[PDB]
């Protein structure tokens, strides 16, 4: 430690079409386990202080991807900023989104109906020491609410066991990682109306 950088930084400006859901993706890599959160509008820089836990855990390296879905038509330009934190470091990328010139839909009201799940928070790469524990997230935007299932490196479905469980919030907890563990784990998020998936690569490093 300590380091933190973007690997997929959002574009600075976007032009909204009429009625179409934007998904702003920001992705980053850093020591231990970076945490991303989004803020809307201009935040005075002093204001973070918005961090959510400052608890002491590992020498892991994580690449984590978070997205912000806008699914309603803006009546006026707005900025969305994604904030990355890990250790003593903080970084951020802002995007201005521009409303349509004209619109058939009501401004500022959420497109109605069901919605395909979208995995909005997920780890791309998670490298940690042998025998350590790792907790791989999967968060979702979905109406109706979305079921989460995980598969392992061999692509078998994961069921609860001494070294594997999926938590209430959909994170997959893997305990005492062994080299047999290295691979890809896939979160399958599903509802009545569709699915999405994400893949996380786990590399258990040595000693």
């Amino acid at each position: 430690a300590d380091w933190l950088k973007f690997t997929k930084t959002p574009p600075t400006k976007l032009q909204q079409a009429d009625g179409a859901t934007i998904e702003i993706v920001c992705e980053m890599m850093g020591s231990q386990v970076p945490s991303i959160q989004w803020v809307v509008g201009h935040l005075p820089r002093s204001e973070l202080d918005d961090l959510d836990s400052n608890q002491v855990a590992p020498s892991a390296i994580v690449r984590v991807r978070s997205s912000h879905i806008i699914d309603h038509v803006l009546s006026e330009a707005r900025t969305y900023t994604c904030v990355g934190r890990t250790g003593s470091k903080t970084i951020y990328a802002s995007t201005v989104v521009h409303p349509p010139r004209s619109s058939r839909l009501t401004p500022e009201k959420t497109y109605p109906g069901a919605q395909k799940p979208r995995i909005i928070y997920t780890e791309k790469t998670h490298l940690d020491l042998m025998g350590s524990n790792i907790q791989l997230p999967c968060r979702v935007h979905a109406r109706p609410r979305a079921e989460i299932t995980w598969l392992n490196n061999e692509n078998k479905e994961i069921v609860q066991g001494h070294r594997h469980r999926v938590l209430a919030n959909g994170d997959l907890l893997i305990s005492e990682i062994k080299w047999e563990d290295m691979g890809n784990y896939k979160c399958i998020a599903r509802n009545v109306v569709g699915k999405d998936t994400a893949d996380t690569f786990v590399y258990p490093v040595l000693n």
């Binding site: 890599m29 690449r63 791309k124 290295m182 691979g183 040595l206």
Partner: protein
């Protein structure tokens, strides 16, 4: 799982680290940050 997928996915991570901040070896056997690092 597959050595190929590990290697693909390994380089994809490594692409970022080396610039600012062997694959086969470490996809077949566990390496450590020192060796992984000697990717640049």
């Amino acid at each position: 799982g597959p050595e190929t997928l590990c290697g693909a996915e390994l380089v994809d991570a490594l692409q970022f680290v080396c610039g600012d901040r062997i694959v086969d070896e470490c996809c077949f056997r566990s390496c450590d940050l020192r060796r992984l690092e000697m990717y640049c």
